[PDB]
Amino acid sequence: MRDAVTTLIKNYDLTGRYLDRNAMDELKAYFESGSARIAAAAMINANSATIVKRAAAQLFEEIPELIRPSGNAYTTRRFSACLRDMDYYLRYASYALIAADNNVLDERVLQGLRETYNSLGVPIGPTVRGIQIMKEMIEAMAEDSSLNSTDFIASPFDHMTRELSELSV
Amino acid sequence: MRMFRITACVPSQTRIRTQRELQNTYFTKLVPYDNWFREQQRIMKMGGKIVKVELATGRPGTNAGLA
Amino acid sequence: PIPPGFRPINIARYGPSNMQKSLRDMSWFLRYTTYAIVAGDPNIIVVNTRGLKEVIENACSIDATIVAIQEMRAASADYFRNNAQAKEIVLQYFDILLSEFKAPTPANKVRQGPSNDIQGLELPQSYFNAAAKRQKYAMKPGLSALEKNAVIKAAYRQIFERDITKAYS
Amino acid sequence: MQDAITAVINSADVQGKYLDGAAMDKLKSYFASGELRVRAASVISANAATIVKEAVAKSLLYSDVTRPGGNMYTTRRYAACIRDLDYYLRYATYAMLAGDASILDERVLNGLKETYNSLGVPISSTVQAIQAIKEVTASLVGADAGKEMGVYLDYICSGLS
Amino acid sequence: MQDAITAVINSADVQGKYLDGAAMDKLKSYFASGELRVRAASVISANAATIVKEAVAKSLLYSDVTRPGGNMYTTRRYAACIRDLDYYLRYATYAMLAGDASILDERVLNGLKETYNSLGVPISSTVQAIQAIKEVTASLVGADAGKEMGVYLDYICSGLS
Amino acid sequence: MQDAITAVINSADVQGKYLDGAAMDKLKSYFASGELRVRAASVISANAATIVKEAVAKSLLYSDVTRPGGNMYTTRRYAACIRDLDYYLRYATYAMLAGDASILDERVLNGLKETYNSLGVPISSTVQAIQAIKEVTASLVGADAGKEMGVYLDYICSGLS
Amino acid sequence: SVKASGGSSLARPQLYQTVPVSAISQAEQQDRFLEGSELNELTAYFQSG
Amino acid sequence: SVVSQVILQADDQLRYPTSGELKGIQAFLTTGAQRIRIAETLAENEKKIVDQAQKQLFKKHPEYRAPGGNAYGQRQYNQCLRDYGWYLRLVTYGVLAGNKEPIETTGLIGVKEMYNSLNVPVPGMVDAVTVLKDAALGLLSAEDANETAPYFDYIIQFMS
Amino acid sequence: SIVTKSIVNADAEARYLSPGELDRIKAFVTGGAARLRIAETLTGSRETIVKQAGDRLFQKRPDIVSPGGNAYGEEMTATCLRDMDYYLRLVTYGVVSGDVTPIEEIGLVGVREMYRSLGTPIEAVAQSVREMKEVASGLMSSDDAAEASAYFDFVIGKMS
Amino acid sequence: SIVTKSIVNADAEARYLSPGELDRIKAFVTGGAARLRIAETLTGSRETIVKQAGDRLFQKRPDIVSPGGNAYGEEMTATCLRDMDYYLRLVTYGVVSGDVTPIEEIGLVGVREMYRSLGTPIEAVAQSVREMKEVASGLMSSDDAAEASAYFDFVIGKMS
Amino acid sequence: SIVTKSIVNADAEARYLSPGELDRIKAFVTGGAARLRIAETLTGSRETIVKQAGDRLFQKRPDIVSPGGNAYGEEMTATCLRDMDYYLRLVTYGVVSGDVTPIEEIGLVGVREMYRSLGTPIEAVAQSVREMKEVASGLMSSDDAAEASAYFDFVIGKMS
Amino acid sequence: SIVTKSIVNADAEARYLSPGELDRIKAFVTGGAARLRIAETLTGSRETIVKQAGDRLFQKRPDIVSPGGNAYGEEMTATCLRDMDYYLRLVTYGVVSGDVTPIEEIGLVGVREMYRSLGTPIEAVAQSVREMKEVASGLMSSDDAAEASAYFDFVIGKMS
């Protein structure tokens, strides 16, 4: 598993280069953004159950056939499994927000996600819609709170939607 | 192959979280010499207590003729 | 029969959508009760009602649900009322339904990561209540010959993926 | 383990004779009691959480062992203890349905007393929990099935003590 | 385990000395008796099941152990008993090929007395069975190889007793 | 295990009360000492092989235990002994960083004495070897942390003796 | 997207248990035919059906 | 503590503790004065915290005082206040240790089936711990409140 | 024993008894009277099974009573018909228990190495229990002898 | 990195990041400027550190560069200085990352097997890294020298 | 020994010895007179072989007796010759026993940890026992040297 | 063969073959002419041994050819003599291999289940192989008779 520091070190190791001024600037930018990343992760540490509950309470009204029969979130066993999946996604989004790199999302979320969801019939479109609902909620809560830097919050969710989502065009 | 007669109790530290079936944590075990160091380290890192251990297998101090 | 503390709910104060949810929940409770009657195992009721109290208590009255399924049991019993050999099945299945529904949500099963490389996981305690549990074979020292040979044969099936002492001695 | 039927088969087999009259009418007694045993097992399987709930309610709560310094104080200790009592109810149900007490020293009384001594588990309060689980089961199912349930629970407490 | 050459090599290694004549005399004795041991082991492996069946016929059949209530009555029990007997024969063959009984008093007699005392197996009857095996092997393979077998077999008897 | 900082937490858990000043001053003393504890642990982590090498060189070298006839004569016994000394140094490092000997009481003092009695390991040789561990660590770090290391090594002495 | 696929075979989680599924699974996991207990469960359930 | 964490990780990896872990130990040993200050002020002023904490809890959820709840009797009321005080006590212990480990090993593992057996609603008790957090956050100073908030947040996470 | 297999399987699955399994125990208890009826009819007519199976065996396969076989004189045949009585007793045990579990407990397994050590033809033992089966089916009513043959054919299948 | 270790330790027990891990990551972030300064002066003086430490190594151990030695010859001497520059680059990577896992993952797994195949004395390679430690520690402040010498001593411990 | 490894394979496969390995034990017994003759001539020449091999070792590698080597001093060279005497005794032990098992279970496994804790160069002691095998092959007859050189080369391979 | 056994064991231990197995392999290689001679003797007398041993079996135990027997029928007796030819071929395989592994891998695994299905008496098959042993030992020289009868009694011991 790699963070931004680890992937920069790996990129310089591959070419066999010492860390130059551009690498120092990237590490410097990560270190000054780290306080805001810590603040955002500590914010979403407190509210995470409310985030996943309201994410379900918005997603199942945008797509109401998930809770109708023949939907995949029909029974309460499937409902609790879907909420556990949303908790998984929010936890790894917290991990990626701390790490400032999406390699943790790639290695531990996305590498078999289409395989599992196609095996169990789980939809991908409503899943990434729930991802973007969680992203909008965290962005709105960060805008409401005293967060000076809010640009990095949307990056792990957008990466997850881009990696998991079927290529439309 | 020289071995040990051990007797130990190792409680599970994760059974409450994992909600699995129960086993008797106390047991009398025959364990080989080559695996006994790793087995003992596993017991003490899991938190169990080895309450009895004897060299029931082989003679103590044998220089040759081990396995 | 046993109303603990319930208050009747006003339709206009409760709202239209919540009333539709309540009506489909009542019809769905009766539908799964009939399905469990057909199946002969209340496992479907146990799985789909064990964790339902915490999710349903946020916007719906839990005492009203208890009185609702109480009236369902009473109405089904009086309308059926065939004989004691066929009524106690419906009675005990509704008792299982009310006990599982009043039972609060148990702890989710947490699969710990064995080392640093492997991610730790969580599983709700409704998924491991319907999914064809493995038979656990433990060699107690005092066991009789039949279950001892069963445990030995199960160990051979585990190690060699088949019963080699039966197939080839 | 064995049962009433397996016990009478073995107790005829140790002299190697066929089924006598005493074996026949005690198996008649077993088959006469069997429906009551299945009804008692069914009702405690249906209510099985609540019996342990009332047992710990009137046994171990508001006690010095629940107070700090005891072995009921910590919540992991509490969860382990109530899981143990649920397992005791399940194995007592198994003994009651089987009709013989060999399943207890087969499965639970293999090493329970001395591993409880190793972990510092209070045997006296555990026996008090067994007396509580006895009286709550006897209140739930009645005197007739409750007495023969309490036979195997007495076997549990005597093996543990 | 420890055969004759590793035994004398360990006796030399404890004193930290090269092999001298005081162990090489026994080493020459072992190499002189080696082909006798191999041919006797070949005969015993040829007649291994027949030795067991004649031994149980001359010592164990028509006794109180194979009467009902005895210690050899049920079919699993008889299969286990003949399994023990040809285990003793095969491990005695191992020790006879080795030249020492380290394998016999270690990988057979580690807890055999304690497990037979816990089960209730008659030690005297097993000793009589081993003596029957010794008589059959002595009458079947010869005098010198027979007494070489008998040394390890009454070593097994001393371990059991 | 449990640290020095968690020791007063566990004591207050047993007492059912908050932190009192008789534990507050001990916690402040641990906070005052912890930087020199963690730095001395870093130093012996950097020089960890040298402690084992000098302890073997000045305690166990050229002795009856390592000559022929000794329990540390053979290369396997020497490798096992230096592995045991490395584990002793690592767990002593763990204790001197942690402020408590619970790591030695649980993860070393569980059955080490009984295994050494089973193996015939010379207890007095191990006691003078850990005296050599004390001398090398006190020479490497200095007596200010040397006596602190010697407290847990004397705990090892009392446990193994 | 993801640069490799581990394979997607069909997964069939058992949504709920019934008496025939329980009896046949109990025989199948223990690698036996349907003996007297499993046939008695099936007989009683089929008569009550 | 975090000292227990680094010894457990080092013993699991079969090595001595390494440089970043040692520097984290130095940082924790530096901040221990702030930890002991937060613990002592919470210990001396716990009573007002539990006072308006239970006031806000039973204002928000008027069902345990109501019929059909679990806090009818004064004995159950005193046990709820005892649970509140024990949770604040474990918060002080974990603030002292620097990590989640005392709160975990004494009050959080198995707590959901613990109150499943006692019929106390777990979301009701996470509302209780949130209003307890609000009382403690209001009572403590700003940097101390920012230090002590994630422990309460972890209790919220693990309970629900 | 059906209840033995019930307890073993319920303990392996680690939960209480399902209602279908409880209905199985109801069915087994209600059929217990019929199976003990079959048991006392068999132990009433036990000796004619032994004698008719023995002399029908000696007329169908006369090799063993001839020299070269295992049945010499009187005492070998006495031990053989004692074994026949033993296997009939095990059949009655399986009938009265409702399952072949006590048959495997006392004798159904290990019989092959038993009779290999004894020199006894296992297929002839199987054929012996075969005429036990149709002599029992002849003497006792066939619709009610289906239950007894349901263990007889398992016995001959294990010894085949 | 420390961030990687904290996220991995949280994810192994399947929770969000603990307050102890947040404090550790905060300490990592605050020490990032000093660590970046240490890495910057190391990579600025990367040529003179390798030059002076190689000179001190070849004066203290002439056997490795005498004929018959592993590094005898100008090409093998340049290869030895290239190895020293490689390990100095890995030391800078570890200084940036705040722990020892990049040095471990790149140049300290299989190093004994590699240098045994190469025929190089691993204790002399450790002496080279120790001379790099001394030369680099002479080029910084005392706390910076101790912080870099932590990673250097990790490389010493892995080589010897 | 080869006999105890044969019976270890035999009871690992849980049956009597195969005829091939019985004839193999016969071949070992018949050759054991020749192995014992090699033992007689080696224990007769146990002094001159180790003295000439030590002189060859110090002539090949003068850095052992030079400053900077491990064996500097009369007692150090005496212990080096004592180690060579022990290893010659182990080679004679292996020639007697017919396999490399006594060398493995006395003084060949763990030799890396042994000479790592001692600081002794493993390639230098491998060269020393290589000179032992060269002087031994010089003093033996051709078949005896061919027999002993396989065990000597196993010592070379596992101690290189 | 013993080459396959030694290579498989060394592969499982992940090591090269020691000289303690290499001398066994070269001894098996050198002592091959006797096994080859026994192999061409047996395949020269491959017919007559089968004919005489089949004649001896059907005269000793006429229950095999009795009505109701397993081999009642001319094609059944032809397949019985074909099975005797099969096991003689496997004995020649084991003789020319110097090992029991070809007999074990071709015609000993699953023989008990196979003849348990087919109803053929396993002790009479053992008697057939024993009678082939006696005919072959009468036909050939005494040491070669012992060498072939070694594999023959291995076959009859695995049979019974």
Ligand SMILES: *[C@@H](C)[C@H]1/C(=C/c2[nH]c(/C=C3N=C(/C=C4\NC(=O)C(CC)=C4C)C(C)=C\3CCC(=O)O)c(CCC(=O)O)c2C)NC(=O)[C@@H]1C
């Ligand atoms: C007659 C048609 C058949 C036959 C039988 C036969 N059996 C024996 C001897 C023994 N059989 C047993 C087996 C058992 N004993 C038990 O208690 C049980 C389970 C209840 C079994 C299965 C035993 C132990 C013996 C030994 C005698 C003893 O009981 O002590 C013989 C005698 C052989 C001898 O050499 O004495 C015979 C003849 N043989 C046949 O060929 C027919 C198939």
Ligand SMILES: *[C@H](C)[C@H]1/C(=C/c2[nH]c(/C=C3N=C(/C=C4\NC(=O)C(CC)=C4C)C(C)=C\3CCC(=O)O)c(CCC(=O)O)c2C)NC(=O)[C@@H]1C
């Ligand atoms: C209040 C008196 C009634 C009520 C209303 C209500 N229902 C929901 C939504 C859900 N209802 C369920 C229930 C079930 N899951 C099952 O598997 C079964 C059969 C055993 C049932 C009956 C579930 C899972 C939901 C959530 C899915 C969804 O959003 O529709 C709500 C909304 C909850 C909210 O907005 O937070 C409400 C208000 N439920 C009752 O039982 C009463 C009849």
Ligand SMILES: *[C@H](C)[C@H]1/C(=C/c2[nH]c(/C=C3N=C(/C=C4\NC(=O)C(CC)=C4C)C(C)=C\3CCC(=O)O)c(CCC(=O)O)c2C)NC(=O)[C@@H]1C
């Ligand atoms: C409850 C009545 C009292 C009591 C219990 C208690 N037990 C433990 C620890 C364990 N108990 C068991 C029990 C079993 N082992 C078996 O083999 C079986 C049969 C299947 C049972 C029931 C086990 C395994 C443990 C270890 C924990 C685990 O889950 O693996 C504790 C915890 C001790 C601790 O400090 O951890 C307790 C508290 N003690 C009391 O005070 C209650 C009155």
Ligand SMILES: *[C@H](C)[C@H]1/C(=C/c2[nH]c(/C=C3N=C(/C=C4\NC(=O)C(CC)=C4C)C(C)=C\3CCC(=O)O)c(CCC(=O)O)c2C)NC(=O)[C@@H]1C
């Ligand atoms: C037969 C000579 C007498 C007899 C004995 C008897 N043995 C058993 C069963 C067992 N036999 C052993 C022995 C060994 N197992 C090994 O692995 C080894 C080393 C090669 C030995 C020596 C053991 C351990 C048992 C225990 C259970 C098992 O089957 O493994 C029994 C059965 C006990 C029971 O019924 O549970 C008996 C009765 N009894 C006699 O009367 C004969 C004289």
Ligand SMILES: *[C@H](C)[C@H]1/C(=C/c2[nH]c(/C=C3N=C(/C=C4\NC(=O)C(CC)=C4C)C(C)=C\3CCC(=O)O)c(CCC(=O)O)c2C)NC(=O)[C@@H]1C
């Ligand atoms: C060295 C100071 C002295 C000594 C050591 C010695 N030890 C052994 C073998 C073992 N020691 C242990 C004990 C431990 N288990 C653990 O988990 C730990 C760390 C906490 C220890 C210390 C064990 C298990 C063994 C067996 C090795 C294994 O299981 O693989 C030996 C070897 C004994 C032999 O070869 O028979 C020796 C020599 N003895 C001395 O004489 C030195 C003074």
Ligand SMILES: *[C@H](C)[C@H]1/C(=C/c2[nH]c(/C=C3N=C(/C=C4\NC(=O)C(CC)=C4C)C(C)=C\3CCC(=O)O)c(CCC(=O)O)c2C)NC(=O)[C@@H]1C
């Ligand atoms: C108060 C916030 C809520 C609540 C409380 C309530 N608690 C109990 C009983 C018990 N509470 C505990 C608590 C703990 N055990 C631990 O290990 C820890 C952490 C250190 C805690 C906090 C225990 C052990 C008990 C049982 C002992 C006893 O009851 O004396 C009750 C009583 C249950 C009953 O019905 O008798 C109650 C009511 N109830 C609420 O409504 C609040 C949300």
Ligand SMILES: *[C@H](C)[C@H]1/C(=C/c2[nH]c(/C=C3N=C(/C=C4\NC(=O)C(CC)=C4C)C(C)=C\3CCC(=O)O)c(CCC(=O)O)c2C)NC(=O)[C@@H]1C
């Ligand atoms: C000589 C070929 C080279 C070498 C020798 C040297 N040896 C020692 C001292 C010891 N050597 C051993 C090794 C063994 N002892 C055994 O019993 C066995 C198995 C048979 C082995 C492999 C030991 C244990 C010692 C220590 C002495 C003791 O027993 O106490 C030294 C001295 C080490 C020191 O630093 O004092 C030396 C120098 N060194 C060379 O350079 C030669 C190539």
